[PDB]
PDB file of C-alpha atoms and ligand atoms in Angstrom:
ATOM      1  CA  UNK A   1      97.687 105.161  98.922  1.00  0.00           C
ATOM      2  CA  UNK A   2     100.914 104.217  96.913  1.00  0.00           C
ATOM      3  CA  UNK A   3     100.244 101.707  93.740  1.00  0.00           C
ATOM      4  CA  UNK A   4      96.806 101.060  94.811  1.00  0.00           C
ATOM      5  CA  UNK A   5      93.605 101.164  92.383  1.00  0.00           C
ATOM      6  CA  UNK A   6      90.405 103.516  91.999  1.00  0.00           C
ATOM      7  CA  UNK A   7      87.973 101.571  94.368  1.00  0.00           C
ATOM      8  CA  UNK A   8      84.870 100.358  92.946  1.00  0.00           C
ATOM      9  CA  UNK A   9      82.256 103.168  93.495  1.00  0.00           C
ATOM     10  CA  UNK A  10      79.398 102.231  96.263  1.00  0.00           C
ATOM     11  CA  UNK A  11      81.943  99.493  97.784  1.00  0.00           C
ATOM     12  CA  UNK A  12      83.575 101.362 100.823  1.00  0.00           C
ATOM     13  CA  UNK A  13      80.196 103.105 102.261  1.00  0.00           C
ATOM     14  CA  UNK A  14      82.239 103.681 105.784  1.00  0.00           C
ATOM     15  CA  UNK A  15      84.821 105.702 104.308  1.00  0.00           C
ATOM     16  CA  UNK A  16      84.490 109.475 105.260  1.00  0.00           C
ATOM     17  CA  UNK A  17      86.584 112.295 104.564  1.00  0.00           C
ATOM     18  CA  UNK A  18      87.473 115.058 107.117  1.00  0.00           C
ATOM     19  CA  UNK A  19      87.576 118.402 105.601  1.00  0.00           C
ATOM     20  CA  UNK A  20      89.064 122.074 106.225  1.00  0.00           C
ATOM     21  CA  UNK A  21      87.409 125.180 105.198  1.00  0.00           C
ATOM     22  CA  UNK A  22      85.669 125.129 102.375  1.00  0.00           C
ATOM     23  CA  UNK A  23      86.397 121.426 101.134  1.00  0.00           C
ATOM     24  CA  UNK A  24      90.302 120.666 101.750  1.00  0.00           C
ATOM     25  CA  UNK A  25      91.026 117.001 102.285  1.00  0.00           C
ATOM     26  CA  UNK A  26      92.361 116.928 105.936  1.00  0.00           C
ATOM     27  CA  UNK A  27      92.439 113.215 106.845  1.00  0.00           C
ATOM     28  CA  UNK A  28      90.384 109.863 106.277  1.00  0.00           C
ATOM     29  CA  UNK A  29      87.897 108.865 108.829  1.00  0.00           C
ATOM     30  CA  UNK A  30      85.603 105.828 109.205  1.00  0.00           C
ATOM     31  CA  UNK A  31      81.666 105.480 110.141  1.00  0.00           C
ATOM     32  CA  UNK A  32      81.562 102.995 112.702  1.00  0.00           C
ATOM     33  CA  UNK A  33      78.135 104.045 114.205  1.00  0.00           C
ATOM     34  CA  UNK A  34      75.025 105.831 112.991  1.00  0.00           C
ATOM     35  CA  UNK A  35      76.531 109.160 114.753  1.00  0.00           C
ATOM     36  CA  UNK A  36      79.966 108.443 115.132  1.00  0.00           C
ATOM     37  CA  UNK A  37      83.368 108.223 113.346  1.00  0.00           C
ATOM     38  CA  UNK A  38      86.792 106.931 113.999  1.00  0.00           C
ATOM     39  CA  UNK A  39      90.035 108.948 112.781  1.00  0.00           C
ATOM     40  CA  UNK A  40      93.497 109.053 114.059  1.00  0.00           C
ATOM     41  CA  UNK A  41      94.097 111.368 117.371  1.00  0.00           C
ATOM     42  CA  UNK A  42      97.183 113.100 115.347  1.00  0.00           C
ATOM     43  CA  UNK A  43      94.190 114.311 112.732  1.00  0.00           C
ATOM     44  CA  UNK A  44      93.885 117.191 115.573  1.00  0.00           C
ATOM     45  CA  UNK A  45      92.925 120.131 113.963  1.00  0.00           C
ATOM     46  CA  UNK A  46      89.591 121.387 114.349  1.00  0.00           C
ATOM     47  CA  UNK A  47      87.082 119.633 111.372  1.00  0.00           C
ATOM     48  CA  UNK A  48      84.901 122.302 109.114  1.00  0.00           C
ATOM     49  CA  UNK A  49      82.566 119.422 107.671  1.00  0.00           C
ATOM     50  CA  UNK A  50      82.719 115.568 107.722  1.00  0.00           C
ATOM     51  CA  UNK A  51      81.879 114.220 104.313  1.00  0.00           C
ATOM     52  CA  UNK A  52      80.431 110.911 103.822  1.00  0.00           C
ATOM     53  CA  UNK A  53      78.921 108.673 100.679  1.00  0.00           C
ATOM     54  CA  UNK A  54      81.361 110.826  98.056  1.00  0.00           C
ATOM     55  CA  UNK A  55      83.791 108.993  95.972  1.00  0.00           C
ATOM     56  CA  UNK A  56      85.543 112.060  94.372  1.00  0.00           C
ATOM     57  CA  UNK A  57      88.269 114.024  96.112  1.00  0.00           C
ATOM     58  CA  UNK A  58      86.852 117.147  94.545  1.00  0.00           C
ATOM     59  CA  UNK A  59      83.682 118.875  95.535  1.00  0.00           C
ATOM     60  CA  UNK A  60      81.498 117.460  92.763  1.00  0.00           C
ATOM     61  CA  UNK A  61      78.080 116.513  93.305  1.00  0.00           C
ATOM     62  CA  UNK A  62      77.339 113.185  94.004  1.00  0.00           C
ATOM     63  CA  UNK A  63      73.608 111.900  94.876  1.00  0.00           C
ATOM     64  CA  UNK A  64      74.732 109.543  97.728  1.00  0.00           C
ATOM     65  CA  UNK A  65      76.591 112.288  99.595  1.00  0.00           C
ATOM     66  CA  UNK A  66      75.832 113.357 103.226  1.00  0.00           C
ATOM     67  CA  UNK A  67      77.495 116.563 105.185  1.00  0.00           C
ATOM     68  CA  UNK A  68      77.975 116.621 108.903  1.00  0.00           C
ATOM     69  CA  UNK A  69      79.733 118.856 111.523  1.00  0.00           C
ATOM     70  CA  UNK A  70      81.502 117.025 114.338  1.00  0.00           C
ATOM     71  CA  UNK A  71      80.156 118.208 117.904  1.00  0.00           C
ATOM     72  CA  UNK A  72      82.744 116.101 119.892  1.00  0.00           C
ATOM     73  CA  UNK A  73      86.079 114.901 119.144  1.00  0.00           C
ATOM     74  CA  UNK A  74      87.267 112.574 121.948  1.00  0.00           C
ATOM     75  CA  UNK A  75      90.915 111.289 121.351  1.00  0.00           C
ATOM     76  CA  UNK A  76      91.805 108.278 123.371  1.00  0.00           C
ATOM     77  CA  UNK A  77      93.179 109.266 126.880  1.00  0.00           C
ATOM     78  CA  UNK A  78      96.280 107.383 126.542  1.00  0.00           C
ATOM     79  CA  UNK A  79      97.210 109.357 123.216  1.00  0.00           C
ATOM     80  CA  UNK A  80      99.997 111.824 123.776  1.00  0.00           C
ATOM     81  CA  UNK A  81     100.576 114.112 121.000  1.00  0.00           C
ATOM     82  CA  UNK A  82     103.277 113.725 119.098  1.00  0.00           C
ATOM     83  CA  UNK A  83     103.664 110.116 120.197  1.00  0.00           C
ATOM     84  CA  UNK A  84     102.317 107.350 117.873  1.00  0.00           C
ATOM     85  CA  UNK A  85     100.632 105.182 120.881  1.00  0.00           C
ATOM     86  CA  UNK A  86      96.935 105.125 120.850  1.00  0.00           C
ATOM     87  CA  UNK A  87      96.332 106.608 117.585  1.00  0.00           C
ATOM     88  CA  UNK A  88      92.521 106.967 117.586  1.00  0.00           C
ATOM     89  CA  UNK A  89      89.834 109.575 118.148  1.00  0.00           C
ATOM     90  CA  UNK A  90      86.249 109.441 118.068  1.00  0.00           C
ATOM     91  CA  UNK A  91      84.348 112.102 116.279  1.00  0.00           C
ATOM     92  CA  UNK A  92      80.440 112.554 117.131  1.00  0.00           C
ATOM     93  CA  UNK A  93      78.304 113.460 114.069  1.00  0.00           C
ATOM     94  CA  UNK A  94      75.664 116.591 114.624  1.00  0.00           C
ATOM     95  CA  UNK A  95      72.874 114.151 113.558  1.00  0.00           C
ATOM     96  CA  UNK A  96      72.833 110.239 112.863  1.00  0.00           C
ATOM     97  CA  UNK A  97      73.089 109.526 109.384  1.00  0.00           C
ATOM     98  CA  UNK A  98      70.450 108.494 106.530  1.00  0.00           C
ATOM     99  CA  UNK A  99      71.171 104.618 105.853  1.00  0.00           C
ATOM    100  CA  UNK A 100      71.931 104.223 102.146  1.00  0.00           C
ATOM    101  CA  UNK A 101      73.643 102.128  99.915  1.00  0.00           C
ATOM    102  CA  UNK A 102      76.644 104.826  99.888  1.00  0.00           C
ATOM    103  CA  UNK A 103      76.677 105.651 103.730  1.00  0.00           C
ATOM    104  CA  UNK A 104      76.931 102.734 105.885  1.00  0.00           C
ATOM    105  CA  UNK A 105      78.665 102.012 109.288  1.00  0.00           C
ATOM    106  CA  UNK A 106      81.389  99.477 109.636  1.00  0.00           C
ATOM    107  CA  UNK A 107      81.829  97.429 113.310  1.00  0.00           C
ATOM    108  CA  UNK A 108      85.350  96.920 114.996  1.00  0.00           C
ATOM    109  CA  UNK A 109      86.090  93.363 115.954  1.00  0.00           C
ATOM    110  CA  UNK A 110      87.798  92.377 119.280  1.00  0.00           C
ATOM    111  CA  UNK A 111      89.522  89.596 117.185  1.00  0.00           C
ATOM    112  CA  UNK A 112      93.187  90.966 116.413  1.00  0.00           C
ATOM    113  CA  UNK A 113      93.576  90.089 112.937  1.00  0.00           C
ATOM    114  CA  UNK A 114      96.695  87.477 112.643  1.00  0.00           C
ATOM    115  CA  UNK A 115      99.989  87.768 110.576  1.00  0.00           C
ATOM    116  CA  UNK A 116      99.418  86.800 106.918  1.00  0.00           C
ATOM    117  CA  UNK A 117      95.595  88.268 106.877  1.00  0.00           C
ATOM    118  CA  UNK A 118      94.763  90.199 103.977  1.00  0.00           C
ATOM    119  CA  UNK A 119      93.274  93.728 104.444  1.00  0.00           C
ATOM    120  CA  UNK A 120      92.267  96.726 102.292  1.00  0.00           C
ATOM    121  CA  UNK A 121      93.240 100.252 103.043  1.00  0.00           C
ATOM    122  CA  UNK A 122      91.714 103.020 101.418  1.00  0.00           C
ATOM    123  CA  UNK A 123      92.180 106.750 101.025  1.00  0.00           C
ATOM    124  CA  UNK A 124      92.398 110.096  98.860  1.00  0.00           C
ATOM    125  CA  UNK A 125      96.335 110.526 100.034  1.00  0.00           C
ATOM    126  CA  UNK A 126      99.039 110.720  97.759  1.00  0.00           C
ATOM    127  CA  UNK A 127      99.470 107.958  95.240  1.00  0.00           C
ATOM    128  CA  UNK A 128     103.266 109.112  94.729  1.00  0.00           C
ATOM    129  CA  UNK A 129     106.021 109.559  97.341  1.00  0.00           C
ATOM    130  CA  UNK A 130     108.193 111.593  97.889  1.00  0.00           C
ATOM    131  CA  UNK A 131     106.176 113.387  95.095  1.00  0.00           C
ATOM    132  CA  UNK A 132     102.884 114.921  96.241  1.00  0.00           C
ATOM    133  CA  UNK A 133     100.344 113.690  93.887  1.00  0.00           C
ATOM    134  CA  UNK A 134      96.467 113.348  94.721  1.00  0.00           C
ATOM    135  CA  UNK A 135      94.390 111.260  93.007  1.00  0.00           C
ATOM    136  CA  UNK A 136      90.920 112.158  91.358  1.00  0.00           C
ATOM    137  CA  UNK A 137      88.960 109.298  93.599  1.00  0.00           C
ATOM    138  CA  UNK A 138      89.020 107.132  96.542  1.00  0.00           C
ATOM    139  CA  UNK A 139      91.850 104.455  96.228  1.00  0.00           C
ATOM    140  CA  UNK A 140      92.012 100.909  97.552  1.00  0.00           C
ATOM    141  CA  UNK A 141      94.777  98.765  97.962  1.00  0.00           C
ATOM    142  CA  UNK A 142      95.466  95.181  99.930  1.00  0.00           C
ATOM    143  CA  UNK A 143      97.862  94.897 102.272  1.00  0.00           C
ATOM    144  CA  UNK A 144      98.967  91.959 104.715  1.00  0.00           C
ATOM    145  CA  UNK A 145      99.369  91.877 108.407  1.00  0.00           C
ATOM    146  CA  UNK A 146     103.020  91.428 109.355  1.00  0.00           C
ATOM    147  CA  UNK A 147     103.778  89.553 112.910  1.00  0.00           C
ATOM    148  CA  UNK A 148     104.663  91.949 115.656  1.00  0.00           C
ATOM    149  CA  UNK A 149     108.351  90.506 115.651  1.00  0.00           C
ATOM    150  CA  UNK A 150     108.695  91.681 112.041  1.00  0.00           C
ATOM    151  CA  UNK A 151     106.827  95.140 113.106  1.00  0.00           C
ATOM    152  CA  UNK A 152     109.270  95.501 115.936  1.00  0.00           C
ATOM    153  CA  UNK A 153     112.333  94.719 113.651  1.00  0.00           C
ATOM    154  CA  UNK A 154     111.251  97.280 111.002  1.00  0.00           C
ATOM    155  CA  UNK A 155     110.871 100.061 113.855  1.00  0.00           C
ATOM    156  CA  UNK A 156     113.071  99.081 116.773  1.00  0.00           C
ATOM    157  CA  UNK A 157     111.889 100.604 120.037  1.00  0.00           C
ATOM    158  CA  UNK A 158     109.077 102.609 118.357  1.00  0.00           C
ATOM    159  CA  UNK A 159     106.285  99.818 118.246  1.00  0.00           C
ATOM    160  CA  UNK A 160     103.782  98.842 121.181  1.00  0.00           C
ATOM    161  CA  UNK A 161     100.665  96.497 121.208  1.00  0.00           C
ATOM    162  CA  UNK A 162      98.329  99.672 120.044  1.00  0.00           C
ATOM    163  CA  UNK A 163      99.570  99.249 116.707  1.00  0.00           C
ATOM    164  CA  UNK A 164     100.241  96.630 113.787  1.00  0.00           C
ATOM    165  CA  UNK A 165     102.493  96.532 110.557  1.00  0.00           C
ATOM    166  CA  UNK A 166     100.843  95.795 107.326  1.00  0.00           C
ATOM    167  CA  UNK A 167     101.724  95.839 103.944  1.00  0.00           C
ATOM    168  CA  UNK A 168     104.834  93.528 103.078  1.00  0.00           C
ATOM    169  CA  UNK A 169     105.220  94.506  99.187  1.00  0.00           C
ATOM    170  CA  UNK A 170     107.823  97.277  98.089  1.00  0.00           C
ATOM    171  CA  UNK A 171     106.131 100.088  95.910  1.00  0.00           C
ATOM    172  CA  UNK A 172     102.534  99.524  97.976  1.00  0.00           C
ATOM    173  CA  UNK A 173     101.577 101.283 101.216  1.00  0.00           C
ATOM    174  CA  UNK A 174      99.457 104.138 102.474  1.00  0.00           C
ATOM    175  CA  UNK A 175     100.997 107.470 102.612  1.00  0.00           C
ATOM    176  CA  UNK A 176     100.331 111.129 103.712  1.00  0.00           C
ATOM    177  CA  UNK A 177      96.748 112.268 103.229  1.00  0.00           C
ATOM    178  CA  UNK A 178      95.646 108.856 104.175  1.00  0.00           C
ATOM    179  CA  UNK A 179      95.637 109.619 107.780  1.00  0.00           C
ATOM    180  CA  UNK A 180      92.822 108.019 110.067  1.00  0.00           C
ATOM    181  CA  UNK A 181      91.371 105.923 107.027  1.00  0.00           C
ATOM    182  CA  UNK A 182      90.236 102.397 106.911  1.00  0.00           C
ATOM    183  CA  UNK A 183      92.044  98.984 107.106  1.00  0.00           C
ATOM    184  CA  UNK A 184      89.405  96.474 106.628  1.00  0.00           C
ATOM    185  CA  UNK A 185      89.880  92.653 107.245  1.00  0.00           C
ATOM    186  CA  UNK A 186      87.389  90.099 106.330  1.00  0.00           C
ATOM    187  CA  UNK A 187      84.539  92.678 106.434  1.00  0.00           C
ATOM    188  CA  UNK A 188      85.412  94.081 109.781  1.00  0.00           C
ATOM    189  CA  UNK A 189      87.163  97.617 110.546  1.00  0.00           C
ATOM    190  CA  UNK A 190      90.649  96.310 112.303  1.00  0.00           C
ATOM    191  CA  UNK A 191      93.089  99.483 111.761  1.00  0.00           C
ATOM    192  CA  UNK A 192      93.391 103.272 111.000  1.00  0.00           C
ATOM    193  CA  UNK A 193      95.926 104.535 108.608  1.00  0.00           C
ATOM    194  CA  UNK A 194      98.456 105.887 111.396  1.00  0.00           C
ATOM    195  CA  UNK A 195     102.292 106.440 110.098  1.00  0.00           C
ATOM    196  CA  UNK A 196     105.127 104.666 108.603  1.00  0.00           C
ATOM    197  CA  UNK A 197     108.105 105.853 106.876  1.00  0.00           C
ATOM    198  CA  UNK A 198     109.344 108.276 104.499  1.00  0.00           C
ATOM    199  CA  UNK A 199     109.121 108.092 101.607  1.00  0.00           C
ATOM    200  CA  UNK A 200     106.184 105.754 101.596  1.00  0.00           C
ATOM    201  CA  UNK A 201     106.337 102.357  99.895  1.00  0.00           C
ATOM    202  CA  UNK A 202     109.819 101.366 101.028  1.00  0.00           C
ATOM    203  CA  UNK A 203     111.193  97.758 101.052  1.00  0.00           C
ATOM    204  CA  UNK A 204     110.925  96.496 104.570  1.00  0.00           C
ATOM    205  CA  UNK A 205     109.417  99.530 105.983  1.00  0.00           C
ATOM    206  CA  UNK A 206     105.468  98.651 106.174  1.00  0.00           C
ATOM    207  CA  UNK A 207     102.875 101.093 107.204  1.00  0.00           C
ATOM    208  CA  UNK A 208     102.018 101.404 110.729  1.00  0.00           C
ATOM    209  CA  UNK A 209      98.014 101.125 111.714  1.00  0.00           C
ATOM    210  CA  UNK A 210      96.221 101.679 114.896  1.00  0.00           C
ATOM    211  CA  UNK A 211      95.258  98.447 116.428  1.00  0.00           C
ATOM    212  CA  UNK A 212      91.645  98.834 116.860  1.00  0.00           C
ATOM    213  CA  UNK A 213      90.842  95.193 118.475  1.00  0.00           C
ATOM    214  CA  UNK A 214      92.673  96.668 121.464  1.00  0.00           C
ATOM    215  CA  UNK A 215      89.911  99.515 121.774  1.00  0.00           C
ATOM    216  CA  UNK A 216      86.434  97.634 121.344  1.00  0.00           C
ATOM    217  CA  UNK A 217      85.399  98.553 125.151  1.00  0.00           C
ATOM    218  CA  UNK A 218      86.889 102.156 124.981  1.00  0.00           C
ATOM    219  CA  UNK A 219      84.866 102.920 121.567  1.00  0.00           C
ATOM    220  CA  UNK A 220      81.734 100.765 122.853  1.00  0.00           C
ATOM    221  CA  UNK A 221      81.908 102.824 126.291  1.00  0.00           C
ATOM    222  CA  UNK A 222      82.702 106.254 124.909  1.00  0.00           C
ATOM    223  CA  UNK A 223      80.109 105.993 122.225  1.00  0.00           C
ATOM    224  CA  UNK A 224      77.381 105.012 125.216  1.00  0.00           C
ATOM    225  CA  UNK A 225      78.962 107.796 127.734  1.00  0.00           C
ATOM    226  CA  UNK A 226      78.242 110.582 124.974  1.00  0.00           C
ATOM    227  CA  UNK A 227      74.625 109.505 123.814  1.00  0.00           C
TER     228      UNK A 227
HETATM  229  N1  J08 B 301     104.106 105.377 105.261  1.00  0.00           N
HETATM  230  C1  J08 B 301     103.010 105.564 105.494  1.00  0.00           C
HETATM  231  N2  J08 B 301     101.919 104.318 105.815  1.00  0.00           N
HETATM  232  C2  J08 B 301     102.306 106.786 106.353  1.00  0.00           C
HETATM  233  C3  J08 B 301     100.971 106.722 106.310  1.00  0.00           C
HETATM  234  C4  J08 B 301     100.132 107.626 106.848  1.00  0.00           C
HETATM  235  C5  J08 B 301     101.095 108.875 107.361  1.00  0.00           C
HETATM  236  N3  J08 B 301     100.395 110.205 107.802  1.00  0.00           N
HETATM  237  C6  J08 B 301     100.918 111.224 107.912  1.00  0.00           C
HETATM  238  C7  J08 B 301     101.395 111.334 109.569  1.00  0.00           C
HETATM  239  N4  J08 B 301     100.950 110.167 110.426  1.00  0.00           N
HETATM  240  C8  J08 B 301     101.648 110.800 111.590  1.00  0.00           C
HETATM  241  C9  J08 B 301     101.554 112.064 111.482  1.00  0.00           C
HETATM  242  C10 J08 B 301     102.103 112.965 112.522  1.00  0.00           C
HETATM  243  C11 J08 B 301     102.142 112.626 114.013  1.00  0.00           C
HETATM  244  C12 J08 B 301     102.272 113.628 114.893  1.00  0.00           C
HETATM  245  C13 J08 B 301     102.552 114.670 114.905  1.00  0.00           C
HETATM  246  C14 J08 B 301     102.866 115.310 113.631  1.00  0.00           C
HETATM  247  C15 J08 B 301     102.409 114.528 112.473  1.00  0.00           C
HETATM  248  N5  J08 B 301     101.720 112.373 110.431  1.00  0.00           N
HETATM  249  C16 J08 B 301     102.283 108.923 107.285  1.00  0.00           C
HETATM  250  C17 J08 B 301     102.906 107.754 106.397  1.00  0.00           C
HETATM  251  O1  J08 B 301     104.555 107.450 106.450  1.00  0.00           O
HETATM  252  C18 J08 B 301     105.418 108.765 107.129  1.00  0.00           C
HETATM  253  C19 J08 B 301     105.299 109.761 106.380  1.00  0.00           C
HETATM  254  C20 J08 B 301     105.734 111.129 106.708  1.00  0.00           C
HETATM  255  C21 J08 B 301     105.719 112.216 106.169  1.00  0.00           C
HETATM  256  C22 J08 B 301     105.498 112.015 104.770  1.00  0.00           C
HETATM  257  N6  J08 B 301     105.435 111.028 104.204  1.00  0.00           N
HETATM  258  C23 J08 B 301     105.156 109.769 104.937  1.00  0.00           C
HETATM  259  C1  LIG B 302      91.818  93.186  97.182  1.00  0.00           C
HETATM  260  O1  LIG B 302      91.744  91.487  97.586  1.00  0.00           O
HETATM  261  C2  LIG B 302      90.256  91.325  97.184  1.00  0.00           C
HETATM  262  C3  LIG B 302      90.262  89.506  98.053  1.00  0.00           C
HETATM  263  O2  LIG B 302      91.129  88.918  97.267  1.00  0.00           O
HETATM  264  C4  LIG B 302      90.047  91.157  95.972  1.00  0.00           C
HETATM  265  O3  LIG B 302      88.618  90.921  95.504  1.00  0.00           O
HETATM  266  C5  LIG B 302      88.516  89.846  94.845  1.00  0.00           C
HETATM  267  O4  LIG B 302      88.304  90.086  93.430  1.00  0.00           O
HETATM  268  C6  LIG B 302      87.972  88.820  92.488  1.00  0.00           C
HETATM  269  C7  LIG B 302      87.005  89.850  91.258  1.00  0.00           C
HETATM  270  O5  LIG B 302      87.840  90.905  90.911  1.00  0.00           O
HETATM  271  C8  LIG B 302      87.293  87.814  93.136  1.00  0.00           C
HETATM  272  O6  LIG B 302      88.280  87.167  93.291  1.00  0.00           O
HETATM  273  C9  LIG B 302      86.296  87.995  94.439  1.00  0.00           C
HETATM  274  O7  LIG B 302      85.243  88.454  93.911  1.00  0.00           O
HETATM  275  C10 LIG B 302      86.925  89.295  95.211  1.00  0.00           C
HETATM  276  N1  LIG B 302      86.803  88.924  96.747  1.00  0.00           N
HETATM  277  C11 LIG B 302      86.449  89.563  97.723  1.00  0.00           C
HETATM  278  C12 LIG B 302      86.661  89.207  98.932  1.00  0.00           C
HETATM  279  O8  LIG B 302      85.546  90.746  97.283  1.00  0.00           O
HETATM  280  C13 LIG B 302      90.152  92.735  95.662  1.00  0.00           C
HETATM  281  O9  LIG B 302      89.887  92.850  94.048  1.00  0.00           O
HETATM  282  C14 LIG B 302      91.521  93.606  96.000  1.00  0.00           C
HETATM  283  N2  LIG B 302      91.410  94.962  95.480  1.00  0.00           N
HETATM  284  C15 LIG B 302      92.665  95.528  95.221  1.00  0.00           C
HETATM  285  C16 LIG B 302      92.212  96.933  95.059  1.00  0.00           C
HETATM  286  O10 LIG B 302      93.564  94.781  94.983  1.00  0.00           O
HETATM  287  C1  NAG B 303     101.474  97.831  91.690  1.00  0.00           C
HETATM  288  O1  NAG B 303     100.799  96.593  92.478  1.00  0.00           O
HETATM  289  C2  NAG B 303     100.842  95.493  91.624  1.00  0.00           C
HETATM  290  C3  NAG B 303      99.800  94.489  92.658  1.00  0.00           C
HETATM  291  O2  NAG B 303      98.635  95.191  92.941  1.00  0.00           O
HETATM  292  C4  NAG B 303     102.051  95.088  90.959  1.00  0.00           C
HETATM  293  O3  NAG B 303     101.920  93.806  90.209  1.00  0.00           O
HETATM  294  C5  NAG B 303     102.884  96.038  90.414  1.00  0.00           C
HETATM  295  O4  NAG B 303     103.933  95.566  89.939  1.00  0.00           O
HETATM  296  C6  NAG B 303     102.984  97.120  91.446  1.00  0.00           C
HETATM  297  N1  NAG B 303     103.359  98.140  90.644  1.00  0.00           N
HETATM  298  C7  NAG B 303     104.464  98.871  90.964  1.00  0.00           C
HETATM  299  C8  NAG B 303     105.257  99.762  90.135  1.00  0.00           C
HETATM  300  O5  NAG B 303     105.367  98.348  91.725  1.00  0.00           O
HETATM  301 NA1   NA B 304      96.986 102.755  90.369  1.00  0.00          NA
END
């Protein structure tokens, strides 16, 4: 997250980290059900461990942390790697979470956030771009939803309704390492960190996010079919 701030501790209880062996941050993810995560479908590598209720990037012990294994990883059937469309995937945890102040699911609303809506994006991705610099703790940044017309103008012939643009201010954006992390608007999960431009936070190059309001039926039906 470029030019965000340290999240307040215990404020993003739906934030997850997908780790590679032994505890290498791979992608962000979001707890959407007591036994399921959403992440970007481009976060394809086999996950070693899911880490929840944890603030720091390092493996330092935190009383609120909960570790899991992914047992199912279901990308949206419309995703076709390396294309950006339908950039979402459901991950089933090996067991249901233990509900705490640090570990709590967030719901996806079918209401699509409108242009100008203020949303919060979070992640442990680089805080600088092009220079790679990881933070010590979870970073939070407010970004505003752009109209689909302004999104199309920024990325001509690269945008469809499965995506939304957000983040109108130069110097502020999500970036590499933030992939699959949450975009929360008015208390509900409406986006996943998907893609954008390089270096991150360029003027007139907003971040591109998976438009989750378009997938509530798929999310609900897939969780139900795999229960
Ligand atoms: N500027 C942003 N808001 C932004 C946010 C997240 C990401 N995530 C990385 C990422 N998304 C998708 C892929 C991918 C897809 C298919 C095949 C292999 C890889 N990789 C990238 C972002 O901007 C582009 C970017 C690229 C490289 C270095 N820095 C920024
Ligand atoms: C993102 O925006 C929200 C909403 O404007 C900010 O939260 C507000 O913060 C102040 C207190 O510091 C108060 O106006 C409210 O109590 C907060 N509102 C809500 C909805 O929580 C938040 O600080 C911003 N975060 C960042 C990282 O900029
Ligand atoms: C970082 O963001 C804040 C607003 O959140 C802004 O006031 C500040 O100028 C930005 N910093 C840079 C270096 O762009
Ligand atoms: Na900062």
